[model samples]
Target chain A: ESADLRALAKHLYDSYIKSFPLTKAKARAILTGKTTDKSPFVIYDMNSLMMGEDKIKFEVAIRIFQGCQFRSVEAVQEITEYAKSIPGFVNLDLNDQVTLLKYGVHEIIYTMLASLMNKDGVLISEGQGFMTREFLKSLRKPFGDFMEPKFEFAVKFNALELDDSDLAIFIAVIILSGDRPGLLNVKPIEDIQDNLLQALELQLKLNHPESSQLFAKLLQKMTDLRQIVTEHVQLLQVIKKTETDMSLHPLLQEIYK
Target chain B: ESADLRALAKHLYDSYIKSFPLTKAKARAILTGKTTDKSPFVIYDMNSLMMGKIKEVAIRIFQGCQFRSVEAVQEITEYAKSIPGFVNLDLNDQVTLLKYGVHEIIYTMLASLMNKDGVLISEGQGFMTREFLKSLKPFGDFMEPKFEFAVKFNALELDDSDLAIFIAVIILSGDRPGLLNVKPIEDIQDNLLQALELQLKLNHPESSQLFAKLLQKMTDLRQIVTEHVQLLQVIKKTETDMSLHPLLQEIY
Candidate 1:
């Protein structure tokens, strides 16, 4: 029903991922805690910052979360606007549209997060703020629990080493997913997802011709993407319950609700 | 190339799930851990026997799942062997594909028996009670997600013709994690998908999206089984006493 919107969705993803300089494999290695020796900080050097951020300003601790959340929110806005540009999206029921942008934003973020991550850990912030998988495991009460599952996933996910284009198609696949809990007319959404999967399969065939398994590997990642989003929602519940002062923005709250 | 194999897969599923004498929902509930009050043994309350064969009772429950699993595997193997090129694949590869893909296919077949209420479970005894069907199996009911999935999927109200093609699509799926012939199988999947597209066009002429909509359900099916398998692996590790079928143990 909306071929142009489909193409626009694909186009937006291509340009978005191009903003980064690294290969998808290299990006994955970095995100997974594998090859971050390329980055400015090594894992050992980060221990001192844990102490530095604490007493100097636990406000820095808040900044730690704030930086990541701000970046995520900004990225989410870009994705929502990008999705809105797709012709078919606005035609969806307003509630469905809201639900898609709300939950689909997390899928897009984690899908992109793999590339931003390094093996040593992730720099959830733009610069000067990185957390090692190990160090992320060191955070307070529920913090470690939250980051640990994601860290474990990124490690496994990065092992697939999808390129930017592959990631872009995957993000579309995630955004188009029919499996979201309260979806209506799941059939229509599934058709969009099917188009995305077909395109993804063809693109993988052309782009990674030597490696026949890449297409299958990428398909499986959507399952992991499904799980990662589910776990992220669970983590949000823990935050909503335990850390009340740390209110989620209304948009973020809408996603979890 | 595989219509014979397709019939074999569908017929075999019709037969094995038939063995349980319950609809898929009831079968799953009983096998999973609910509806035990109807079980011959009031075994859940058997703490006195708990120290004795209580472990055995749990194993018995484990065996119930395994037995159906084994029967299904046996049938799928027979079906796989009859497929022209499949029997030609290396023995190791055949086992790998079977080990990897059987459960995925099994879940696909289980989908047919599912509806909004849950698996019908007993045509003879009629559907199980809602409370019994809903008994939460922290481990067994990992597929709470599936019932939700089933409700939405059943909403599509697919026909037997569409289902016949979809079932083939499910069995020939190429995405099982450790296969030697993914592309080969996907080639088969592609043809089957075209057939499904053809089937859907005539059958669901009103809806342009039917074929694709049907296909994505397989993706969701794999995801649910993946979670279920992960839970089983955790259960296998923690409850070392409950041994698994050799096929399941090898795959898990």
Candidate 2:
């Protein structure tokens, strides 16, 4: 088994080294831990080098494993299944086995997180601290239902009943709508105003330096929003004036005051 | 005469102030030397504002007088003559009198220099330094007439010695044949090379720090020119390449 692993590692290394001719020396040094002053020249050539289409298939498998969402079991299974099918990657060679194992663990973590966030097969989160903590804890679960993962992550929510820092992200997702709307519910304008006032009142009552600073930032954002809305109103007025001037027909202009 | 001058000045000021409302207070302060804290609205109504356009014209005329050169005189005279006859410009007013006289003198100087450089038809250093100095002595010439006027102006010379700088400009002008060979007899390629070398030699000497710096720049320029010329050649060569293989042509 060890011999088979060594042979597989060598084959994978050879195949990987060919495309990146410039980094061949670096790769060799990584594998061997030996430095040589000799000028660059090809040391080993493998003819079993899978050509164009097959090469692309191998690369896609690697990319899928790397990109798999750690919060879902389905994502991990999909990546592992796809990775195992890659032509040159099928047999368990030592180096290939190591790489696959590393990638598998990463995919499993992502799948777990995805599963925790999933609501009717769609990953949803309020972008709050508590939700994020729950999502993060989901990453520790391994593939194949090992002992029902047990861990807890806690997040302290502000008096606003939301993660203060995550408010921007929550608001953004809400504005984008569609699948994103699943991530955050659209609060009524009056509800938002009421919540904001409550938060401000709490901060003022507390009178803590940090709370005061946070309140100041919130007030600045409110002022900026007001200014933007005012500018928009002014622009609308200008457009109306232009429209009115254009609407007066030449014939109408002769008789109209 | 004082009344007419004041009226003309006022007309100039008002026209100028109306367009540049922000500068109203500053202009009033300059003329009166009195600091008045009045809003833009209040000032326009209270002050006897001169028209901004007339003031602009007067200012231009004043600025023209500041630069004393025979060529400056000619340039201004030409400009003044070209101004619409309908515009109420008093030629006799101190401002107008000074403007026209100075412009006439500068125009003659420019014509003389142009002739000396073999650029214009007029010949000899007509109205030389002595004549210029005598004319300028009374008005208090702000600018050094000979050095400033000559150095400031650009004269298109047929036999400009600096080859490198000239070629650099030509190359930057994008190998345009018309730019270098604007004159009938001059060859574009030869003149460009001459100009580049001349400019390089002047700015770079063996011991100077800038010597290597300039050489490197010239080398880079040469490489770019080479690449550009080669690309053009490649384009010409690929006519058959495109016909034979459309896909290859697309990649190229």
Candidate 3:
């Protein structure tokens, strides 16, 4: 039974680490039960890290979490609480917490989606790193409750592939583990989903689902978040080109010409 | 004396017509004495013509008198009084009347300075037509005072030659016509030279004795006015460009 327990803990650790990449030290701390940290914890002060280097640290933190799991609920709770006690963690307002959660979730989804495409490890890593940086940057503006309902609907709609008990457990875990309010609030979740779906439907209806993919149907819904974010960044450039005079916007001269 | 009188009349007539093209037809009528039906008298009708064009006509009439002998004050008075009767003439409130006279006089002086080079005839005609159309289209809006002032300065500053008398004539003519108020005014020939010399002294205090040849100056002034009017017509293309971009405006 002790061996089975260790094996189960290892499987959970492997699953988490498979989805997230962390430094050897962080992974050892988690597996050896030497340090207390939560699954969704911000492992690095991203803003402090150099532009390209921050993504590396983020991947390392994710790997550490995925490689190991808590031995008990008490252990998990202690880790989560310790994570919350971090100076950076406390500084995050409700909106920041939501943004971080969405970002982490997107990373997992992106990895899974990339695996389906048979993407090589190097390609997947690069894509994931690029995606993570962009998604975080975009979340500078906290989304309001308008997006909550759609987010809930998207999770549920996608989770139809799972059994009822599994879905319930998944939801309960998400609610209990998330430190922010409104993440699990059913009404807000539905409202946000409804708005998102409406926007998506409008785009699809107009025969321009591609345009919507850059913004509306991107994050919070599926694993296409990275592609969507990258596309949106490009779209912003295009918009700037068309709006400003060629003389005024030097960067856009090529596009306009 | 008869030869000098004929020479003087021709000089005045040419100068008057050159500066105010719109008045050519009317001036011709006056010179030929064809006033039995449509006399040189100006009738005030809001629908008749544009205010700017009418002012051009009035200026031409005034110019004719400016060149004539001092004895021709009666003709000048008749012409001035006739202008007050034109359709759009009444639209020029007392203040605008004063301003119009000033603008015309200044413009004539500026024309003299320009000496007719770099002037486009097609452009002037187009500009005159457009200005007439624009004035007729809008009846009651206040004329842009700054535009008049700017045009005056533009013509004067951009001119190639330094003709102080012409400049003086422009400044002096801007004053309200004394004849219009039934006041005994300075002799036209004497006052014309006096005003020109005074303006020259004021503008160029160092040139204490700037000589002005009456015949040559009058001829040059007329040619400049005609050339400017033609340039005004050519600039209509710019107006079309501005219309395309409603937000754009000539800085000047």
Question: TM-scores for all candidates?
Answer: 0.60, 0.14, 0.17
Model 1 segments more than 4 A misplaced: A1-10, A14-63, A127-129, A184-188, A240-245, B1-106, B116-147, B151-219, B222-252
Give the CAPRI class of candidate 1. incorrect
Point to the candidate with the largest TM-score.
1
Candidate 2: residue A182 lDDT (0-100): 19
Q: Write down the worst ten-residue block by lDDT for model 2 chain B.
A: B117-126
Question: Model 2 over residues A17-68: C-alpha lDDT tens digits?
Answer: 3321223233223223263542122111122112222322223222222222
Instruction: Quote the lDDT for B198 in model 3.
Output: 41
User: Pairing residues by index, what is the TM-score of model 1?
Assistant: 0.60
lDDT of each: 0.60, 0.28, 0.31
| Cα RMSD to the true fold for all candidates | 9.4, 33.3, 33.7
> Which candidate, 1 or 2, has the higher DockQ?
1
Cα distance off (Å), candidate 2, residue B205 = 2.0
Per-residue error for A194 in candidate 2, Å, reads 66
How much RMSD separates candidate 3 from the native structure? 33.7
Full candidate order by lDDT, most accurate first: 1, 3, 2
I-RMSD for candidate 3? 39.3
Candidate with more favorable, higher lDDT: 1 or 3: 1
After superposition, the stretches of candidate 2 with alpha carbons farther than 4 Å from their true spots are: A1-51, A55-257, B1-164, B171-194, B206-252
Cα shift from native, residue A248, model 3 (Å): 62
